[PDB]
């Protein structure tokens, strides 16, 4: 019987209970966005999780927004070019978490977000 850890395994919503993805696994998740005609975009932050500093009313949280890395990659057909910006983001901000998000112009919403890099 194992005890679920209380520290060191803070989470980043969907796919963060899986082991760290390989580069091939990561590309497969990117190709899923492209095949779905969803626009990938990178987000980064040195603070990983939500907090409640400015208000505590229902539905208000701080730290849900991260910072956009460049722009959404409209018209992307090459999943490796997303990987190329991920490596750019990690080289400029090695101490920042980087997650890959997705937008759909059809549903008119953000519908994807999964972690792609954690600082050591």
């Amino acid at each position: 019987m194992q005890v679920w850890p209380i520290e060191g395994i803070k989470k980043f919503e969907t796919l963060s209970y899986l082991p760290p993805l390989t580069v091939e696994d990561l590309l497969k998740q990117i190709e899923y966005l492209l095949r779905s005609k969803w626009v990938p975009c990178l987000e980064f932050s040195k603070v990983g999780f939500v907090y409640r500093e400015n208000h505590r009313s229902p539905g208000y949280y701080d730290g849900r927004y991260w910072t956009m890395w460049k722009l959404p990659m409209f018209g992307c057909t090459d999943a490796t070019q997303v990987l190329k910006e991920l490596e750019e983001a990690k080289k400029a901000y090695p101490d920042a978490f980087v997650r890959i998000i997705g937008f759909d112009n059809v549903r008119q919403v953000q519908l994807i977000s999964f972690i792609a890099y954690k600082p050591p």
Partner: protein, 438 residues
């Protein structure tokens, strides 16, 4: 008579509310008379003439049976289609819609059995309703949760836990990976646990689990009560505690109370989880009652952000009213119980909540059948884990995310499900332990 109320050449108006009844006439009652009787006894039928009818034009207020046909279902059953004028219904009142359509006709002697199967809610009527306080997309944005079904757990034992031991179970479930825990529909305020004590300890569990994991957590705090004043008082304290979601048993509480609560939740940013307690009193039998899709449409109009939608372990019927709960435009599809094309003109959708005997092995089927916009509720599927609530939650979160990953890669969940789960068992001892017992 027949030709006053059986009008088979009537062309339905875009403002009509349409109903599809499954009618079982009494022996000797021809189908055209049963159809006229369903329309008449759910509108302007009178057993004797009244002079006051000369003060108006009653044809503008009658329901019309514009089609009736036998169904392959059981003895002597027909589907009667009825059109109701828009002027009959009070704006924004599910209570008046039900009263107007199902209030009287089910007791008519010439009808041995009667079941309302579907309603066509026109935009001119549905626009008078607020609908869900937030809806699927707003909820995802508020919780910052995307790309997977949400996960919940029903706290057990249903009754008999102290408020603090209730919150202790909630914290352990949430910290393991579940998004929500759930007040039982029966859990309101009782001698074993008073509601304000539960709200306090459940709030501590929510925030302790959220701080530990870094993900937004919730617990459906049940505001169902004996009076509308008590119901709002419980919602007000949840608002003060700042928690994200409350809960209501909309059928036993009632639509008048539910619509008031939905309005409060919209006014104060609270998500509204809806339980369908007592639905099977009404929707179980094929021959008499109201199908759940009618009660599901009514909840979407009166207001709710989640609604319990049953299990899949009949599927196509369930998929039918899931679409009616979630989508903006649902094409007619009687094979899935959709008797009318339904246009919701941008009224938000409701997240369906799957619950009943579900454990980790069912995660591939659930993710494939419902897709991402659902909540998967576990009972013993979390609390029955041999290592406790947090490892049980971890097993369910791991199993779900392994299914989402495989589906995103293009793999076939209906055929590769067991191997996807078995493969995930290799690096998750928590999931392996769950799969050894189930």
């Amino acid at each position: 008579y027949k030709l006053t109320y059986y009008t088979p050449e009537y062309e339905t108006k875009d403002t009509d509310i349409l109903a599809a009844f499954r009618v079982t006439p009494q022996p000797g009652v021809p189908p055209e008379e049963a159809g006229a009787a369903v329309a008449a006894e759910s509108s302007t039928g009178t057993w004797t003439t009244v002079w006051t009818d000369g003060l108006t034009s009653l044809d503008r207020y009658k329901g019309r049976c514009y089609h009736i046909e036998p169904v392959v279902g059981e003895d002597n059953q027909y589907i009667a289609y009825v059109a109701y004028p828009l002027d009959l219904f009070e704006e924004g009142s599910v209570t008046n819609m039900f009263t107007s359509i199902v209030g009287n006709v089910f007791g008519f002697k010439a009808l041995r059995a009667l079941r309302l199967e579907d309603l066509r809610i026109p935009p001119t009527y549905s626009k008078t309703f607020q609908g869900p306080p937030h809806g699927i997309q707003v909820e995802r944005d508020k919780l910052n949760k995307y790309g997977r079904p949400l996960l919940g757990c029903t706290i057990k034992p249903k009754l008999g836990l102290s408020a603090k031991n209730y919150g202790r179970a909630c914290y352990e479930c949430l910290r393991g990976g579940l998004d929500f825990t759930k007040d039982d529909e029966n859990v309101n305020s009782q001698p074993f646990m008073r509601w304000r004590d539960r709200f306090v300890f459940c709030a501590e569990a929510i925030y302790k689990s959220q701080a530990e994991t870094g993900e937004i957590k919730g617990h459906y705090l049940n505001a169902t009560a004996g009076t509308c004043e008590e119901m709002i008082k419980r919602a007000v304290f949840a608002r003060e505690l700042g928690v994200p979601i409350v809960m209501h048993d909309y059928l036993t509480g009632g639509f008048t109370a539910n619509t008031s609560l939905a309005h409060y939740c919209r006014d104060n940013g609270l998500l509204l989880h809806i339980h369908r307690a007592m639905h099977a009193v009404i929707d179980r039998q094929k021959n008499h009652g109201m199908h759940f899709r009618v009660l599901a449409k009514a909840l979407r109009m009166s207001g709710g952000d989640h609604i319990h939608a049953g299990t899949v372990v009949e599927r196509e019927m369930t998929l039918g009213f899931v679409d009616l709960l979630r989508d903006d435009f649902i094409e007619k599809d009687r094979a899935r119980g959709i008797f009318f094309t339904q246009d919701w003109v941008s009224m938000p959708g409701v997240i369906p909540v799957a619950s009943g005997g579900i454990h980790v092995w069912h995660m591939p089927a659930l993710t494939e059948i419902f897709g991402d916009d659902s909540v998967l509720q576990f009972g013993g599927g979390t609390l029955g884990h041999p290592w406790g609530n947090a490892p049980g939650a971890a097993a369910n979160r791991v199993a779900l995310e392994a299914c989402v990953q495989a589906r995103n890669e293009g793999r076939d969940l209906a055929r590769e499900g067991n191997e996807i789960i078995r493969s995930a068992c290799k690096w998750s001892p928590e999931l392996a332990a769950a799969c050894e017992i189930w």
